[PDB]
Design an enzyme around this catalytic site. Structure first.
Site, PDB file in Angstrom:
ATOM      1  N   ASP A 173      43.858  40.549  30.092  1.00 27.53           N
ATOM      2  CA  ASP A 173      42.797  39.698  30.686  1.00 27.53           C
ATOM      3  C   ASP A 173      41.562  40.539  31.055  1.00 27.53           C
ATOM      4  O   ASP A 173      40.944  40.344  32.101  1.00 27.53           O
ATOM      5  CB  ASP A 173      43.356  38.896  31.862  1.00 27.53           C
ATOM      6  CG  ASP A 173      42.553  37.659  32.266  1.00 27.53           C
ATOM      7  OD1 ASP A 173      41.628  37.274  31.520  1.00 27.53           O
ATOM      8  OD2 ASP A 173      42.858  37.093  33.330  1.00 27.53           O
ATOM      9  N   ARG A 204      35.121  38.722  35.391  1.00 25.39           N
ATOM     10  CA  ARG A 204      35.811  38.016  36.504  1.00 25.39           C
ATOM     11  C   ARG A 204      36.930  38.890  37.118  1.00 25.39           C
ATOM     12  O   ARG A 204      37.162  38.758  38.323  1.00 25.39           O
ATOM     13  CB  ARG A 204      36.313  36.657  36.013  1.00 25.39           C
ATOM     14  CG  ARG A 204      37.392  36.682  34.951  1.00 25.39           C
ATOM     15  CD  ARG A 204      37.817  35.266  34.624  1.00 25.39           C
ATOM     16  NE  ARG A 204      38.705  35.329  33.488  1.00 25.39           N
ATOM     17  CZ  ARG A 204      38.339  35.198  32.227  1.00 25.39           C
ATOM     18  NH1 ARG A 204      37.098  34.872  31.917  1.00 25.39           N
ATOM     19  NH2 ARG A 204      39.234  35.333  31.266  1.00 25.39           N
ATOM     20  N   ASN A 205      37.551  39.766  36.334  1.00 29.19           N
ATOM     21  CA  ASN A 205      38.646  40.667  36.753  1.00 29.19           C
ATOM     22  C   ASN A 205      38.164  42.102  37.007  1.00 29.19           C
ATOM     23  O   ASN A 205      39.018  42.998  37.054  1.00 29.19           O
ATOM     24  CB  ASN A 205      39.709  40.705  35.658  1.00 29.19           C
ATOM     25  CG  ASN A 205      40.606  39.506  35.783  1.00 29.19           C
ATOM     26  OD1 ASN A 205      40.928  39.162  36.928  1.00 29.19           O
ATOM     27  ND2 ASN A 205      40.959  38.868  34.657  1.00 29.19           N
ATOM     28  N   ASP A 260      43.258  42.670  38.163  1.00 22.23           N
ATOM     29  CA  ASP A 260      43.751  41.385  37.646  1.00 22.23           C
ATOM     30  C   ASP A 260      44.214  40.569  38.849  1.00 22.23           C
ATOM     31  O   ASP A 260      45.143  41.035  39.555  1.00 22.23           O
ATOM     32  CB  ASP A 260      44.822  41.580  36.586  1.00 22.23           C
ATOM     33  CG  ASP A 260      45.118  40.264  35.910  1.00 22.23           C
ATOM     34  OD1 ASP A 260      44.852  39.217  36.554  1.00 22.23           O
ATOM     35  OD2 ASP A 260      45.571  40.289  34.743  1.00 22.23           O
TER      36      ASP A 260
HETATM   37  C1  LIG Z   1      46.753  46.510  34.894  1.00 19.09           C
HETATM   38  O1  LIG Z   1      46.513  47.077  36.212  1.00 19.09           O
HETATM   39  C2  LIG Z   1      46.254  46.313  37.333  1.00 19.09           C
HETATM   40  C3  LIG Z   1      45.568  46.897  38.394  1.00 19.09           C
HETATM   41  C4  LIG Z   1      45.291  46.215  39.541  1.00 19.09           C
HETATM   42  C5  LIG Z   1      45.749  44.931  39.572  1.00 19.09           C
HETATM   43  C6  LIG Z   1      45.533  44.085  40.644  1.00 19.09           C
HETATM   44  C7  LIG Z   1      45.810  44.660  41.990  1.00 19.09           C
HETATM   45  O2  LIG Z   1      45.837  43.521  42.844  1.00 19.09           O
HETATM   46  C8  LIG Z   1      44.519  43.124  42.907  1.00 19.09           C
HETATM   47  C9  LIG Z   1      43.974  42.678  44.104  1.00 19.09           C
HETATM   48  C10 LIG Z   1      42.633  42.306  44.161  1.00 19.09           C
HETATM   49  C11 LIG Z   1      42.104  41.801  45.352  1.00 19.09           C
HETATM   50  N1  LIG Z   1      40.950  42.429  45.929  1.00 19.09           N
HETATM   51  C12 LIG Z   1      40.614  43.672  46.335  1.00 19.09           C
HETATM   52  N2  LIG Z   1      39.396  43.609  46.902  1.00 19.09           N
HETATM   53  C13 LIG Z   1      39.000  42.318  46.844  1.00 19.09           C
HETATM   54  C14 LIG Z   1      37.885  41.718  47.246  1.00 19.09           C
HETATM   55  C15 LIG Z   1      37.690  40.341  47.081  1.00 19.09           C
HETATM   56  C16 LIG Z   1      36.479  39.829  47.559  1.00 19.09           C
HETATM   57  C17 LIG Z   1      35.285  39.509  48.059  1.00 19.09           C
HETATM   58  C18 LIG Z   1      33.873  39.263  48.690  1.00 19.09           C
HETATM   59  C19 LIG Z   1      32.919  40.344  48.175  1.00 19.09           C
HETATM   60  C20 LIG Z   1      34.004  39.406  50.240  1.00 19.09           C
HETATM   61  N3  LIG Z   1      33.384  37.928  48.314  1.00 19.09           N
HETATM   62  C21 LIG Z   1      38.674  39.571  46.470  1.00 19.09           C
HETATM   63  N4  LIG Z   1      39.825  40.255  46.047  1.00 19.09           N
HETATM   64  C22 LIG Z   1      39.959  41.586  46.254  1.00 19.09           C
HETATM   65  C23 LIG Z   1      41.873  42.339  42.989  1.00 19.09           C
HETATM   66  C24 LIG Z   1      42.396  42.792  41.785  1.00 19.09           C
HETATM   67  C25 LIG Z   1      43.710  43.186  41.752  1.00 19.09           C
HETATM   68  O3  LIG Z   1      44.192  43.637  40.588  1.00 19.09           O
HETATM   69  C26 LIG Z   1      46.434  44.383  38.504  1.00 19.09           C
HETATM   70  N5  LIG Z   1      46.700  45.076  37.399  1.00 19.09           N
END
Ligand SMILES: COc1ccc([C@H]2COc3cc(Cn4cnc5cc(C#CC(C)(C)N)cnc54)ccc3O2)cn1
Length: 282
Positions: free
Chosen positions: A147, A151-152, A165
């Site tokens: 993905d 957006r991600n 993600d």
């Molecule tokens: C393939 O590797 C990965 C790596 C990380 C991830 C995940 C980790 O869990 C996550 C958790 C988040 C959540 N996150 C961290 N800071 C954030 C900030 C916001 C916001 C806002 C405002 C600016 C206040 N409007 C929303 N979600 C947030 C975003 C992406 C993620 O990806 C998934 N697969």
């Protein structure tokens, strides 16, 4: 290139990550779907040093079963094996015991990129590099993302971009960019569409579409409906035109990434390097 010694979706959880939920007061919800969500929070004394700080916690809604509650653990498990990298949304810890699963991540204070661009309709190049670095890392662990899109992508302090993600904490069900196909079709490589094949070379394609998102946040294939006509267009090799704010070199990367033969497309390694050169010339 990289050799895979082990695959993290078949390794059990590593309990070194575990953190006690009682040192965690929920702030505002940051994003939500119809199966799970993501919310600000303060972790008291986190890491191998007793320091408080701000974080994001991913977690299930009411409505979860063996499908999703597992898919959160998968994400948890996969994530415990990549370990840190400045250009990625890193796992800090988890809560897997004494309640539903809580996955604690860096809080990226500026949120998603597609909104940061839409908001503001060399900086564009940093973002491209940083995302490219992050994917080169995931690539170095033979971890397919599936993905890649603006957006991600997330923006932490000092506008450094990290891939992520949102998974279950996104309303995929009510989001028209995700097509029912018994999927984010506008971002997908043809081998991913037509043949359910999904490589790092597919993610390069999607990373192409992300660069075009240099349109300062336009919906791909603008005004083109996803249907019989759209699949033929992309097999017969149609490419989106150069964005307004794209340097020619950069559009050359996108056209490289949108090569129909997966192997003819470059690698996150190459892209990072071509990006590195184009940086001091700017
Ligand atoms: C393939 O590797 C990965 C790596 C990380 C991830 C995940 C980790 O869990 C996550 C958790 C988040 C959540 N996150 C961290 N800071 C954030 C900030 C916001 C916001 C806002 C405002 C600016 C206040 N409007 C929303 N979600 C947030 C975003 C992406 C993620 O990806 C998934 N697969």
């Amino acid at each position: 290139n990289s050799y895979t010694f082990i695959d993290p979706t078949q390794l059990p959880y590593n309990e070194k990550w575990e953190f006690p939920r009682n040192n965690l007061q929920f702030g505002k919800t940051l994003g939500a779907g119809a199966f799970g969500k993501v919310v600000e929070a303060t972790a008291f004394g986190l890491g191998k040093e007793d320091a408080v700080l701000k974080v994001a916690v991913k977690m299930l809604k009411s409505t979860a079963h063996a499908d999703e509650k597992e898919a959160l653990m998968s994400e948890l498990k996969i994530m415990s094996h990549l370990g840190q990298h400045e250009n990625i949304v890193n796992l800090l810890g988890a809560c897997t015991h004494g309640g539903p699963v809580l996955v604690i991540t860096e809080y990226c204070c500026y949120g998603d990129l597609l909104n940061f661009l839409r908001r503001k309709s060399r900086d564009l190049l940093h973002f491209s590099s940083q995302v490219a670095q992050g994917m080169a890392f995931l690539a170095s662990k033979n971890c397919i993302h599936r993905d890649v899109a603006a957006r991600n992508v997330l923006l932490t302090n000092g506008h450094v971009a990290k891939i992520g993600d949102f998974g279950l904490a996104r309303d995929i069900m009510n989001d028209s960019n995700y097509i029912v196909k018994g999927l984010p079709v506008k971002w997908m490589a043809p081998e991913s569409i037509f043949d359910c094949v999904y490589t790092v070379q597919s993610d390069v394609w999607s990373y192409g579409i992300l660069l075009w998102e240099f349109s300062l946040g336009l919906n791909p294939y603008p005004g083109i409906l996803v249907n019989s006509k759209f699949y033929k267009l992309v097999k017969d090799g149609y490419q989106m035109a150069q964005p307004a704010f794209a340097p020619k070199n950069i559009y050359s990367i996108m056209q490289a990434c949108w090569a129909l033969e997966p192997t003819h497309r470059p690698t996150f390694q190459q892209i990072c390097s071509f990006l590195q050169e184009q940086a001091q010339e700017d």
